[PDB]
Structure 1
Amino acid sequence: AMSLILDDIILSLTNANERTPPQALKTTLSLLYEKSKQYGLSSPQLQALVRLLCETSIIDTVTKVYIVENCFLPDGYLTKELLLEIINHLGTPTVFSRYRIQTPPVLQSALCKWLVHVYFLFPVHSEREHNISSSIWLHLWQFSFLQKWITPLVIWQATTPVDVKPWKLSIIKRCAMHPGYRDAPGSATLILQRFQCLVGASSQITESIITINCNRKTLKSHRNLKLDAHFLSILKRILSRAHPANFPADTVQNTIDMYLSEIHQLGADQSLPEYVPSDSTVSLWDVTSLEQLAQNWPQLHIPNDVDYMMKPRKVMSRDSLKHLYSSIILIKNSRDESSSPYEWCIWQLKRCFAHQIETPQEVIPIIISVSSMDNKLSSRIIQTFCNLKYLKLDELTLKKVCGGILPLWKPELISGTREFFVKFMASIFMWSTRDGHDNNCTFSETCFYVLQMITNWVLDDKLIALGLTLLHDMQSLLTLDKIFNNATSNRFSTMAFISSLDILTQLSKQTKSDYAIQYLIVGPDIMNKVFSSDDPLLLSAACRYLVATKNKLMQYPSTNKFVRMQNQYIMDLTNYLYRNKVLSSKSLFGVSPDFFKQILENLYIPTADFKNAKFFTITGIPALSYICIIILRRLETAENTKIKFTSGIINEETFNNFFRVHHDEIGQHGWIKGVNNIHDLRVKILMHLSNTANPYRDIAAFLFTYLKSLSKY
């Protein structure tokens, strides 16, 4: 549309020959002025325009340089056929071309300056066209007039230290020590400083630098590359408007400033060639942006610098895609057990376990990043390193791998993985709880990672039967007396268990899934031991599991194996938390009810008013004995009482003392509003416990939903 109008304007400028119009040419030039600053002079139009400017001489050099400055605003990437039409017009007449009409050297310097300004728009050269361009621009650097502006081109293109061949230095130095250049030392020195950064010390370079010395003034005057900011602003506008998400203003500015910063920083401070066979094989390192990666995709060439592409971003630099390198390598060649990132990651792990590396903390995230998001590799790291062999070597590194790899891993063959992980976790349990090595959260953390893997599995069917079996095989390990205890408990294991007990809670809450309730009821072996434990938040997790599993057992009849033990858990966890009648009932936690009666003999307690009923409630159980006192002393502050309950424990004895020593006020006021009987206090602290701010909300919720006495909340 508009591009057709611009093509017509350029064709009007082209065919404007043999007519010599007085002012029609001026109107065409103004039309070009106003239409090139709007859309952006697509690259074939730029080629036709530079050809018109260099060949024809209808307009003088003043306006030609002016329209090179203010109209050459590309909207795209500068196809490689435009750079040639510029190179083909740079130079001077010679014995061999004495008839060819010369283009004004001022116009040639203007073209080289424009090339410097839009250098971030150069196309990626095909690893041999680059070797030819980096010599064309060096031979064009010998003409003095376009030498101030070809210097940035030789500097920016001189990446890849292979491009620092000494035959270049023989030409750089030869032009610096030359009488009639007047600006060569301050450019040759910049080119040599760039070459120096690229290839290290290189005594030749540093002995050539102090031979053509610039006096620190006409070297700084040459480092400071002054790119026209108005031109670049219009160019950023045109690019962003013409190609969203491809040359946005921020990345274009970051790129221009990166190039200028290279030229500035100059003064402050790669395996082997392999016979590039084809003329069009864009290397991978050279690819700067994503559009260039996609344009040169069928011709891409991934070199064997794996140790470089793996080991250690808005700019459109050559390293802008170093994070995509490993991703666009498994794509080119399909993921083949012989890819470069796979083998690299595996070898780096093998050299991280055997401590043959300096900083594992720097290469381990690089392995987890490439393997956690790739199943074919995440499935071989598990077969190789997830065993006891590599656990005694380094357990601190295997834990990180299991914490990055296992959380996301679905097996390809359901069959042989349950046995594999049972063996793995049993080996970890034996190695972690061995003699002399008490515990350091190796099994509980790895078990935790496995729990996360089991959640991942369970979330998607066809694995929910394998997942829920590994879940119970993990619960049968996280509840062993050596690691899950009542006296020496090491809360690690009681904290990777409440996560397993929540895998189940989330399952039992959701509907529309096929899994027998055999996989949802934990079993009186492990479950009884969770109830008789001592920490409050594990008991809260058990109560949350028990309350969010009834809607899955209503459907089943009463004479069921799993609705009889599930109703047994609640039959006793309710007379162990609220209605303390463990002596009249039978078999509280599988243990007979006269075991407690005999324990309460020789168990010394100073008072004996209400002894057998003193410690079996939510206020007296060693798990929630002090939390209830804290809830009481917090209700006292929330009500601003004036009696301030004078002890910490709540039981039938101390409550009667507190109510007989302050009978006058308790009746009148000064204490918890509704509290008149001990059960009033136990219901008040329960209601305060069921406010969703403390981790023990689920105990109150369970008592409320199952007791049938305080169901009114």
Structure 2
Amino acid sequence: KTTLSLLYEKSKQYGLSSPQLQALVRLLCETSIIDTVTKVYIVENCFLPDGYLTKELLLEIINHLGTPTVFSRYRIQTPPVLQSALCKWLVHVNISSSIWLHLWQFSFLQKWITPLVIWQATTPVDVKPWKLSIIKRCAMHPGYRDAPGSATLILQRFQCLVGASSQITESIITINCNRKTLKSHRNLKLDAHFLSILKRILSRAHPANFPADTVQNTIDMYLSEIHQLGADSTVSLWDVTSLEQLAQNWPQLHIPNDVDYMMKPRKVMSRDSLKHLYSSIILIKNSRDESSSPYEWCIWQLKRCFAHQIETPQEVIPIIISVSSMDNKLSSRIIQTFCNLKYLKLDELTLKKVCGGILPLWKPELISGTREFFVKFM
């Protein structure tokens, strides 16, 4: 135990690299001579991640996460409490999504796998009906107290991701949930004291890339996403999910018309990065003309703010400013239509912030008709 005690201090001061983490967890899972309680303590405290764990390190943890069965003759024995603690440390730090769900059905892992399967799944293609069947199976089968609450979370995550399927409420009605696990599974262990050591280790090792502070923001993005649900080729504009994959099918990419879904603000790149390019895509897919749907959307949403039909007037004001900067032929109609004093009476404050951000950009177009119209405004 003296060597292990020295290892704990050495691992605490110098952290643990990704090759070191997988080598240590392999040796820890290989032998069971040491006590089970100190094996849990090693993963919980002695293990120190650097940035985010690599896929191979996650795969090695997946190997050791398997619960002991009658098929344990050649496998290396691992206590269920060690397996629960091994995945608990994973909470602290397409094919992958399927791996987690097959690991989630185990009783001692359902409380810690549940965040992992949500993180890896970000596309509707990963949602399959047979996965939901396994989820509801683990939910209904008794003896798994933490399953139905965790089952509902994965059910909601899959249903919201696909966006078009049969209602999952019937799969939650047939199962019994006290909702105390659902609240617990929704929450993620912050581990604030562990976070400082994680920051220093990511600043130290190994390549100073893919920092976990950014992953912590992604974890916060993961945390926000979990809470809201709990409580060549011819494809569409949103059927793509990667920027590089969008370039290949660009000559054959057709755009469906869902305007504000463009405007209203991991294994595969997130959608948020695409929507910034999506606005420019429509600006280049369609030439600047009065018949463009997004251009008409800007006019319609502007009228909503003046009449206070929108929930909050300033929600779309920054979006309109960015779009209306260009299109001198259609920047005038933003001003010409709304420079009348009748709109001023409805709301003088909203007119000010849209007037000041467009007039410096705008160019003269009308030879006559427009000096007097503006002079009338003064």
TM-score (norm. length: structure 1): 0.37
> Judging changes above 3 Å, is the alpha-carbon distance between structure 1 residues 170 and 232 closer, same or farther for their aligned structure 2 residues?
same
Q: Structure 1: how far apart are the matches of 2:153 and 2:295?
A: 41
Deviation at 1:181, TM superposition (A): 3.3
> Judging changes above 3 Å, is the alpha-carbon distance between structure 1 residues 249 and 156 closer, same or farther for their aligned structure 2 residues?
closer
Deviation at 1:46, TM superposition (A): 3.0
Cα RMSD after superposing both structures: 7.3
**Contact 1:148–1:187 at 8 Å: present in 2 too?**
yes
Q: Structure 2: how far apart are the matches of 1:298 and 1:77?
A: 37
Q: Structure 1: how far apart are the matches of 2:88 and 2:26?
A: 17
> Judging changes above 3 Å, is the alpha-carbon distance between structure 1 residues 335 and 48 closer, same or farther for their aligned structure 2 residues?
farther
Q: Structure 1: how far apart are the matches of 2:367 and 2:8?
A: 69
Q: Structure 1: how far apart are the matches of 2:26 and 2:252?
A: 30
Say which is worse superposed, 37-46 or 286-295, in terms of deviation.
286-295
> Judging changes above 3 Å, is the alpha-carbon distance between structure 1 residues 223 and 41 closer, same or farther for their aligned structure 2 residues?
same
Deviation at 1:133, TM superposition (A): 2.1
> Judging changes above 3 Å, is the alpha-carbon distance between structure 1 residues 30 and 94 closer, same or farther for their aligned structure 2 residues?
closer
Per-residue CA deviation, residues 42-91 of structure 1 (Å, 9 max, x unaligned), is 43443343344334667554443322111332222333333223223332
Q: Structure 1: how far apart are the matches of 2:250 and 2:205?
A: 23
Q: Structure 2: how far apart are the matches of 1:345 and 1:88?
A: 53
Q: Structure 2: how far apart are the matches of 1:313 and 1:387?
A: 50
Deviation at 1:283, TM superposition (A): 13
Which protein has greater RCO, CA pairs closer than 8 Å, 6+ apart? 2
Per-residue CA deviation, residues 563-598 of structure 1 (Å, 9 max, x unaligned), is xxxxxxxxxxxxxxxxxxxxxxxxxxxxxxxxxxxx
Aligned pair count reads: 375
Say which is worse superposed, 330-339 or 196-205, in terms of deviation.
330-339
Out of 173, 180, 185, the residue aligned to residue 222 of structure 1 is 185
**Contact 1:176–1:212 at 8 Å: present in 2 too?**
yes
Per-residue CA deviation, residues 576-631 of structure 1 (Å, 9 max, x unaligned), is xxxxxxxxxxxxxxxxxxxxxxxxxxxxxxxxxxxxxxxxxxxxxxxxxxxxxxxx
Per-residue CA deviation, residues 115-159 of structure 1 (Å, 9 max, x unaligned), is 111xxxxxxxxxxxxx22222211111222222211232345555
Deviation at 1:366, TM superposition (A): 0.9
**Contact 1:39–1:242 at 8 Å: present in 2 too?**
no
> Judging changes above 3 Å, is the alpha-carbon distance between structure 1 residues 193 and 389 closer, same or farther for their aligned structure 2 residues?
closer
Per-residue CA deviation, residues 263-319 of structure 1 (Å, 9 max, x unaligned), is 567654xxxxxxxxxx99999999999999999999999999763241249999976
Stretches of structure 1 that go unaligned for 5 or more consecutive residues are 1-25, 118-130, 269-278, 424-713
Q: Structure 2: how far apart are the matches of 1:280 and 1:88?
A: 37
Per-residue CA deviation, residues 189-213 of structure 1 (Å, 9 max, x unaligned), is 4434555666789774222222222
Per-residue CA deviation, residues 343-391 of structure 1 (Å, 9 max, x unaligned), is 9768977999999999876434312034549999979989999999999
Deviation at 1:340, TM superposition (A): 11
Q: Structure 1: how far apart are the matches of 2:143 and 2:326?
A: 61
Q: Which has the larger radius of gyration?
A: 1
Q: Structure 2: how far apart are the matches of 1:111 and 1:200?
A: 33
Q: Structure 2: how far apart are the matches of 1:298 and 1:79?
A: 36
**Contact 2:339–2:374 at 8 Å: present in 1 too?**
no
> Judging changes above 3 Å, is the alpha-carbon distance between structure 1 residues 249 and 205 closer, same or farther for their aligned structure 2 residues?
closer
> Judging changes above 3 Å, is the alpha-carbon distance between structure 1 residues 294 and 161 closer, same or farther for their aligned structure 2 residues?
closer
User: What secondary structure sits across from 1:405 in the alignment?
Assistant: coil
Between structures 1 and 2, the one with greater helix share: 2
> Judging changes above 3 Å, is the alpha-carbon distance between structure 1 residues 91 and 243 closer, same or farther for their aligned structure 2 residues?
closer
> Judging changes above 3 Å, is the alpha-carbon distance between structure 1 residues 192 and 366 closer, same or farther for their aligned structure 2 residues?
same
Deviation at 1:33, TM superposition (A): 2.8
> Judging changes above 3 Å, is the alpha-carbon distance between structure 1 residues 180 and 395 closer, same or farther for their aligned structure 2 residues?
closer
Deviation at 1:339, TM superposition (A): 12
Q: State the identity as a percent.
A: 100
Q: Structure 2: how far apart are the matches of 1:285 and 1:160?
A: 11
Q: Structure 1: how far apart are the matches of 2:206 and 2:292?
A: 35
**Contact 1:379–1:409 at 8 Å: present in 2 too?**
yes
Per-residue CA deviation, residues 433-468 of structure 1 (Å, 9 max, x unaligned), is xxxxxxxxxxxxxxxxxxxxxxxxxxxxxxxxxxxx
> Judging changes above 3 Å, is the alpha-carbon distance between structure 1 residues 343 and 51 closer, same or farther for their aligned structure 2 residues?
farther
**Contact 1:39–1:75 at 8 Å: present in 2 too?**
no
User: What secondary structure sits across from 2:14 in the alignment?
Assistant: coil
Q: Structure 1: how far apart are the matches of 2:300 and 2:77?
A: 61
> Judging changes above 3 Å, is the alpha-carbon distance between structure 1 residues 287 and 242 closer, same or farther for their aligned structure 2 residues?
farther
Per-residue CA deviation, residues 307-340 of structure 1 (Å, 9 max, x unaligned), is 3241249999976997797589999999999999
Residue matched to 2:103: 140
Answering whether residue 110 of structure 2 is matched by residue 157 of structure 1, we say no
Equivalences for residues 401-416 of structure 1 within 5 A:
403-408=356-361
**Contact 1:89–1:103 at 8 Å: present in 2 too?**
yes
**Contact 2:122–2:268 at 8 Å: present in 1 too?**
no
Q: Structure 1: how far apart are the matches of 2:17 and 2:249?
A: 20
> Judging changes above 3 Å, is the alpha-carbon distance between structure 1 residues 113 and 216 closer, same or farther for their aligned structure 2 residues?
closer
> Judging changes above 3 Å, is the alpha-carbon distance between structure 1 residues 233 and 288 closer, same or farther for their aligned structure 2 residues?
farther
Q: Structure 2: how far apart are the matches of 1:42 and 1:234?
A: 13
> Judging changes above 3 Å, is the alpha-carbon distance between structure 1 residues 320 and 194 closer, same or farther for their aligned structure 2 residues?
same
> Judging changes above 3 Å, is the alpha-carbon distance between structure 1 residues 357 and 66 closer, same or farther for their aligned structure 2 residues?
closer
**Contact 2:68–2:79 at 8 Å: present in 1 too?**
no
> Judging changes above 3 Å, is the alpha-carbon distance between structure 1 residues 60 and 309 closer, same or farther for their aligned structure 2 residues?
farther
Residue matched to 2:328: 375
Q: Structure 2: how far apart are the matches of 1:78 and 1:255?
A: 14
Say which is worse superposed, 243-252 or 64-73, in terms of deviation.
243-252
**Contact 2:97–2:120 at 8 Å: present in 1 too?**
yes
> Judging changes above 3 Å, is the alpha-carbon distance between structure 1 residues 91 and 150 closer, same or farther for their aligned structure 2 residues?
same
Q: Structure 1: how far apart are the matches of 2:236 and 2:40?
A: 36
> Judging changes above 3 Å, is the alpha-carbon distance between structure 1 residues 396 and 237 closer, same or farther for their aligned structure 2 residues?
closer
Residue matched to 1:433: none
TM-score (norm. length: structure 2): 0.63
Say which is worse superposed, 257-266 or 229-238, in terms of deviation.
257-266
